[PDB]
Write a protein that binds this ligand. Structure first.
Ligand SMILES: CC(C)[C@H](C)n1cc(-c2cc(C(C)(C)O)n(C)n2)c2[nH]nc(N)c2c1=O
Length: 281
């Protein structure tokens, strides 16, 4: 008799490494607390100011399309225990599997469902990329890696953070690149980029950073963020992917409205994506 959210190191046996989450390596573990021979698979992220904020946030969320908090283990450091999403990320999935257009439109829809909820709870994700969206057994999107997620203070529209280390700047709106201000609408921009990725089946050669650097026309370096910002401010965007319908590119372009106030909300995007998914099913 005790708290299920408390995980004990003696019953966690590591199967393998899964990947590098932002601010923490994720691994796969078998948790057999009752020694019944089977236990359960779980994902475990090792964390070292806001270095716990991913646990603080993710434990307050309950939704089918957001990866589910299970508990913690601190037997200095901390291990976030999450559900194991067994098919991994879309970035590594889509290039290795054949996937139709409607199925892609359905993954996009699910992301919006999860993100509408997230924003309702007054959080921003700040890391919405195909790489951080995971598939379960039924090919259901679970949104993951809340390493950069923040609580938007109440009454406010954005949150200001200048990340001392790496961040996904090729998924980031100009206000993010320029003012380090992250609105709810900024996550919609990232979703837009995430949908571009979907439709390119995450071909690395067509990936947002590959594309954006070609368009900038200058080699990667200290001035890139500035040039990317000036490029996006001139209204250039990622190209319509091959065999992507015009109507679906328009959706991406609307999520890519330069000024953040003119972008769709995740609420607004849900009916639209259902209707467009229907049209191509
Ligand atoms: C969201 C990413 C950044 C992290 C690393 N991540 C990865 C996985 C995963 C990775 C794989 C492979 C294909 C082997 O690399 N699989 C099958 N699953 C995973 N599963 N469940 C989770 N919560 C979870 C996760 O967070």
């Amino acid at each position: 008799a005790s708290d299920p959210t408390v995980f004990h190191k003696r019953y966690l046996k590591k199967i393998r490494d899964l990947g590098e989450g932002h601010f923490g390596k994720v691994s796969l573990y078998c948790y057999d607390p009752t020694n019944d021979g089977t236990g359960e698979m779980v994902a475990v992220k090792a964390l070292k100011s806001g270095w716990k904020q991913e646990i603080d946030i993710l434990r307050t969320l309950y939704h089918e399309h957001i990866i589910k908090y299970k508990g913690c283990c601190e037997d200095k450091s901390l291990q976030l225990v999450m559900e194991y999403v067994p098919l991994g990320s879309l970035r590594d999935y889509l290039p290795r599997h054949s996937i139709g257009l409607a199925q892609l439109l359905l993954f996009a829809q699910q992301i919006c469902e999860g993100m509408a909820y997230l924003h309702s709870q007054h959080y921003i994700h700040r890391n919405l990329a195909a790489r951080n969206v995971l598939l379960d057994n039924d090919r259901l999107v679970k949104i993951g890696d809340f390493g950069l997620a923040k609580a938007v203070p109440e009454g406010h529209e954005y949150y200001r953070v200048r990340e001392d280390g790496d961040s996904p700047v090729f998924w980031y709106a100009p206000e993010c690149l320029k003012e380090y201000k992250f609105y709810y609408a900024s996550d919609v921009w990232s979703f837009g980029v995430t949908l571009y990725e979907l439709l390119t089946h995450c071909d690395s050669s067509q990936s947002p950073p590959t594309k954006f650097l070609e368009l900038i026309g200058i080699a990667q370096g200290q001035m890139t963020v500035l040039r990317l910002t000036e490029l996006l401010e001139r209204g250039e965007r990622l190209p319509r992917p091959d065999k992507c319908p015009c109507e679906v590119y328009h959706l991406m372009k609307n999520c890519w409205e330069t000024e953040a106030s003119f972008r769709p909300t995740f609420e607004n995007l849900i009916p639209i994506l259902k209707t467009v998914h229907e049209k191509y099913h």
